[PDB]
Amino acid sequence: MQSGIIHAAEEKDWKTAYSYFYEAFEGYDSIDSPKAITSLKYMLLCKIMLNTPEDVQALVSGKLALRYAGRQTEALKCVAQASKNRSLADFEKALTDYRAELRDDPIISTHLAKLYDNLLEQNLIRVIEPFSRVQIEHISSLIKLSKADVERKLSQMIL
């Protein structure tokens, strides 16, 4: 689990962090409940960080995942489906619906914020090619957000 934690913070690759997290959860198979919950949470967080939420449904449908199912697990599944929909708003909705369940600063809040920035950058870059000059409130309308936050994100990208 710690090796996966370190690799997840290194952020160069997340598949090896997925392997370490799964091994830790496999070690925690109905032995230590809180450590098992943390291991599966980290495993699914790096799985969605791999930008492949398609295998999330199979992973959460696994026997051990159902055995250790919980509100935090369902919140992570909703985060995965938000990544499926590529909706930064849906990800923000899931984070607010389960905030205290995913408010943990260590590799939970940090990675969710990093992923949220990734969707923001991807949405902006995906909608920005056609426009040689576009009004920013139109950009906010397409992204379905306010004006100040969209302007702040677009700035921080361009600085």
Partner 1 sequence: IVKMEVDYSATVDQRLPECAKLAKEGRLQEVIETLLSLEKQTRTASDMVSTSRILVAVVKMCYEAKEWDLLNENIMLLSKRRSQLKQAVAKMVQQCCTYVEEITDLPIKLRLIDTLRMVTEGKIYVEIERARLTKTLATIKEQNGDVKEAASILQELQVETYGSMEKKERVEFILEQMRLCLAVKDYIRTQIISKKINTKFFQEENTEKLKLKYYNLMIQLDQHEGSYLSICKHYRAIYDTPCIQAESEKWQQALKSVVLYVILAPFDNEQSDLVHRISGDKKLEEIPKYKDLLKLFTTMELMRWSTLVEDYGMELRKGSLESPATDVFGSTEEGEKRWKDLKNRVVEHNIRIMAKYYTRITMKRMAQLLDLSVDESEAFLSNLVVNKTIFAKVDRLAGIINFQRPKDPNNLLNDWSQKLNSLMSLVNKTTHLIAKEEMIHNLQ
Partner 2 sequence: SKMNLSEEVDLEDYVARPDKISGADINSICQESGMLAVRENRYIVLAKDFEKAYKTVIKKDEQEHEFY
User: If you ran DSSP here, which 8-state letter would residue 32 be given?
Assistant: -
Query: CA 117, CA 131: separation in Å to the nearest integer?
Result: 22
Q: Which residues bind partner 2 (CB under 8 A)?
A: 15-16, 18-19, 22-23, 26
Q: Quick one: 22 or 28, whose CB is closer to partner 2?
A: 22
Instruction: Copy the structure tokens of residue 10.
Output: 């290194």
Q: What is the smallest separation between the CB atom of 88 and partner 1, expressed in angstroms?
A: 18
In a 13 Å sphere around the CA of 94, the CA atoms on its Cβ side amount to: 24
Q: What is the smallest separation between the CB atom of 142 and partner 1, expressed in angstroms?
A: 9
Query: CA 65, CA 25: separation in Å to the nearest integer?
Result: 10
16 binds, among partner 1, partner 2, none (CB under 5 to 8 A by kind): partner 2
Q: What is the smallest separation between the CB atom of 137 and partner 1, expressed in angstroms?
A: 10
Whether the Cβ atoms of residue 51 and residue 111 lie closer than 8 Å to each other? no
Q: Which residues bind partner 1 (CB under 8 A)?
A: 126-127, 129-135, 138
26 binds, among partner 2, partner 1, none (CB under 5 to 8 A by kind): partner 2
Q: What is the smallest separation between the CB atom of 140 and partner 1, expressed in angstroms?
A: 13
Residue corresponding to tokens 């306010």: 146
